Design a protein around this motif. Structure first.
Motif, PDB file in Angstrom:
ATOM      1  N   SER A 105      11.700 106.253  31.559  1.00 51.01           N
ATOM      2  CA  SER A 105      13.083 106.316  32.066  1.00 51.01           C
ATOM      3  C   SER A 105      14.129 105.943  31.019  1.00 51.01           C
ATOM      4  CB  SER A 105      13.297 105.414  33.248  1.00 51.01           C
ATOM      5  OG  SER A 105      13.045 104.028  32.967  1.00 51.01           O
ATOM      6  N   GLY A 106      13.745 105.216  29.979  1.00 52.40           N
ATOM      7  CA  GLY A 106      14.757 104.615  29.030  1.00 52.40           C
ATOM      8  C   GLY A 106      15.408 103.298  29.580  1.00 52.40           C
ATOM      9  N   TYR A 107      14.998 102.833  30.762  1.00 49.62           N
ATOM     10  CA  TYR A 107      15.606 101.609  31.296  1.00 49.62           C
ATOM     11  C   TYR A 107      15.258 100.402  30.412  1.00 49.62           C
ATOM     12  CZ  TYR A 107      16.023  97.789  34.839  1.00 49.62           C
ATOM     13  OH  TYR A 107      16.203  96.673  35.630  1.00 49.62           O
ATOM     14  N   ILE A 108      16.204  99.490  30.194  1.00 47.77           N
ATOM     15  CA  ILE A 108      15.868  98.328  29.386  1.00 47.77           C
ATOM     16  C   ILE A 108      16.072  96.966  30.053  1.00 47.77           C
ATOM     17  CG2 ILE A 108      16.340  99.594  27.260  1.00 47.77           C
ATOM     18  CD1 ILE A 108      18.764  98.112  26.883  1.00 47.77           C
ATOM     19  N   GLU A 109      15.229  95.992  29.688  1.00 45.98           N
ATOM     20  CA  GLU A 109      15.575  94.608  29.937  1.00 45.98           C
ATOM     21  C   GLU A 109      15.669  93.935  28.589  1.00 45.98           C
ATOM     22  OE1 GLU A 109      14.256  94.104  34.519  1.00 45.98           O
ATOM     23  OE2 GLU A 109      14.643  92.451  33.051  1.00 45.98           O
ATOM     24  N   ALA A 110      16.580  92.959  28.436  1.00 48.26           N
ATOM     25  CA  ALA A 110      16.648  92.246  27.135  1.00 48.26           C
ATOM     26  C   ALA A 110      17.063  90.780  27.246  1.00 48.26           C
ATOM     27  CB  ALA A 110      17.504  93.006  26.112  1.00 48.26           C
ATOM     28  N   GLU A 111      16.685  89.957  26.244  1.00 54.83           N
ATOM     29  CA  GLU A 111      17.098  88.544  26.264  1.00 54.83           C
ATOM     30  C   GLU A 111      17.314  88.182  24.846  1.00 54.83           C
ATOM     31  OE1 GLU A 111      17.378  86.365  28.993  1.00 54.83           O
ATOM     32  OE2 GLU A 111      15.871  87.098  30.501  1.00 54.83           O
ATOM     33  N   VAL A 112      18.147  87.173  24.629  1.00 51.15           N
ATOM     34  CA  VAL A 112      18.355  86.644  23.271  1.00 51.15           C
ATOM     35  C   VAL A 112      17.535  85.379  23.266  1.00 51.15           C
ATOM     36  CG1 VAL A 112      20.005  85.572  21.621  1.00 51.15           C
ATOM     37  CG2 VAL A 112      20.644  87.652  22.902  1.00 51.15           C
ATOM     38  N   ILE A 113      16.722  85.213  22.236  1.00 51.97           N
ATOM     39  CA  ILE A 113      15.826  84.068  22.159  1.00 51.97           C
ATOM     40  C   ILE A 113      16.049  83.396  20.788  1.00 51.97           C
ATOM     41  CG2 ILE A 113      14.044  85.081  23.812  1.00 51.97           C
ATOM     42  CD1 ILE A 113      12.310  85.810  21.334  1.00 51.97           C
ATOM     43  N   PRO A 114      15.759  82.116  20.711  1.00 48.82           N
ATOM     44  CA  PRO A 114      16.053  81.390  19.451  1.00 48.82           C
ATOM     45  C   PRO A 114      15.152  81.762  18.292  1.00 48.82           C
ATOM     46  CG  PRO A 114      14.995  79.921  21.005  1.00 48.82           C
ATOM     47  CD  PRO A 114      15.282  81.218  21.773  1.00 48.82           C
ATOM     48  N   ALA A 115      13.859  82.063  18.530  1.00 45.23           N
ATOM     49  CA  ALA A 115      12.996  82.644  17.457  1.00 45.23           C
ATOM     50  C   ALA A 115      11.797  83.350  18.085  1.00 45.23           C
ATOM     51  CB  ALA A 115      12.522  81.547  16.491  1.00 45.23           C
ATOM     52  N   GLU A 116      11.140  84.234  17.342  1.00 44.07           N
ATOM     53  CA  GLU A 116      10.029  85.012  17.875  1.00 44.07           C
ATOM     54  C   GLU A 116       8.745  84.196  17.953  1.00 44.07           C
ATOM     55  OE1 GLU A 116      11.293  88.776  15.728  1.00 44.07           O
ATOM     56  OE2 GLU A 116       9.486  89.507  16.739  1.00 44.07           O
ATOM     57  N   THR A 117       8.735  83.192  18.823  1.00 46.05           N
ATOM     58  CA  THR A 117       7.533  82.367  19.022  1.00 46.05           C
ATOM     59  C   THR A 117       6.646  82.886  20.176  1.00 46.05           C
ATOM     60  OG1 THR A 117       8.466  80.810  20.628  1.00 46.05           O
ATOM     61  CG2 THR A 117       8.856  80.349  18.240  1.00 46.05           C
ATOM     62  N   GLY A 118       5.370  82.485  20.172  1.00 45.39           N
ATOM     63  CA  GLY A 118       4.402  82.805  21.257  1.00 45.39           C
ATOM     64  C   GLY A 118       4.955  82.422  22.628  1.00 45.39           C
ATOM     65  N   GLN A 119       5.438  81.179  22.759  1.00 46.12           N
ATOM     66  CA  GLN A 119       5.984  80.706  24.032  1.00 46.12           C
ATOM     67  C   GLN A 119       7.180  81.584  24.532  1.00 46.12           C
ATOM     68  OE1 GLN A 119       4.220  78.709  26.447  1.00 46.12           O
ATOM     69  NE2 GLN A 119       5.852  80.082  27.425  1.00 46.12           N
ATOM     70  N   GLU A 120       8.134  81.914  23.682  1.00 46.80           N
ATOM     71  CA  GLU A 120       9.276  82.709  24.185  1.00 46.80           C
ATOM     72  C   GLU A 120       8.819  84.122  24.589  1.00 46.80           C
ATOM     73  OE1 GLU A 120      12.462  82.048  24.656  1.00 46.80           O
ATOM     74  OE2 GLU A 120      12.348  80.096  23.928  1.00 46.80           O
ATOM     75  N   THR A 121       7.884  84.653  23.802  1.00 49.38           N
ATOM     76  CA  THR A 121       7.396  86.008  24.007  1.00 49.38           C
ATOM     77  C   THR A 121       6.580  86.062  25.269  1.00 49.38           C
ATOM     78  OG1 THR A 121       7.390  86.412  21.612  1.00 49.38           O
ATOM     79  CG2 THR A 121       6.130  88.049  22.981  1.00 49.38           C
TER      80      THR A 121
END
Ligand SMILES: OC[C@H]1O[C@@](CO)(O[C@H]2O[C@H](CO)[C@@H](O)[C@H](O)[C@H]2O)[C@@H](O)[C@@H]1O
Ligand code: BTE
Ligand code: BTE
Lengths: 144, 140
Positions: free
Chosen positions: A25-41
């Protein structure tokens, strides 16, 4: 194919934007995170899987996805994680829209959510067409 | 209406959970926030409105819903401002609270369980299936 999402990262103003695109569909969800860590991901994937029926994620195979926390999250949520599978149906597009609203937001993350709103509501294919939000619900709905 | 949501907060382990329920389906979105602020509420509402067609949100009288950042966000997203799931979600939260180190993980496991759970026997639907069936029907 209705259960398949592509996850990708984009960096702007020294910050990390994690993006999940529903491929069909091209639909997106997004978030701003402080760094690309395992826990945030892991937390990002858990949230997404609770909001939509996520069967499969294609990732860039970044080190955040090889973490044990991310694997435990996909297993708990019954997601199959497919690392290194290319995007074949977006980061350019999201950045352009972010540029269109950036001066209305005191912080980047507000601008990123505005851009996700605009992307998901935008009618594609001229005046008789459908937005990504319309497309995803039409593809996912089981009993219309 | 397909566009009607109800929002409120619940308190736990010293933290605030903001919960939105799509009133006609029972589908929920939820986030754990440090404190119930105007900035957190505004950001929450904007995320919600980018993800689902939100026309009207019903809220409690709290001063976080009435801040000038919340009004700017609602004006921009086209949102007009004006039961048990807090209690159901809470129930599920305790049921899994041990499968997770952090409260916010257990909260999202609970959202997952709630939105996927078939109600009734063979023939039933989950809240996630109801919201998509409702919106898709409205679109045709
Ligand atoms: O971007 C930070 C922003 O997101 C919120 C949720 O509304 O925080 C949650 O989501 C973030 C993105 O997944 C996580 O990084 C964060 O850990 C989680 O609590 C807001 O509270 C926050 O301002
Ligand atoms: N999720 C959705 C359904 C119908 C229209 C929409 N616009 S944004 N998200 C939408
Ligand atoms: N948004 C959704 C549609 C269909 C099933 C689902 N389970 S969780 N969220 C869902």
């Amino acid at each position: 194919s209705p259960g398949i999402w592509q996850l990708d990262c984009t960096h702007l103003e020294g910050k990390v934007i994690l993006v999940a695109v529903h491929v069909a569909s091209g639909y997106i969800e997004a978030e701003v995170i402080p760094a690309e860590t395992g826990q945030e991901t892991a937390y990002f994937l858990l949230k997404l899987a609770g909001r939509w029926p996520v069967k499969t994620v294609h990732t860039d195979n970044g080190s955040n996805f090889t973490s044990t926390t991310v694997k435990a999250a996909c297993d708990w949520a019954g997601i199959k994680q497919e690392d290194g599978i290319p995007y074949n149906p977006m980061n350019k597009e999201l950045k352009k829209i972010i540029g269109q609203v950036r001066d209305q937001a005191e912080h980047l993350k507000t601008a990123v959510q505005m851009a996700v709103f605009i992307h998901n509501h935008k009618r594609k294919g001229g005046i008789g067409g459908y937005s990504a939000g319309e497309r995803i619900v039409d593809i996912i709905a089981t009993d219309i």
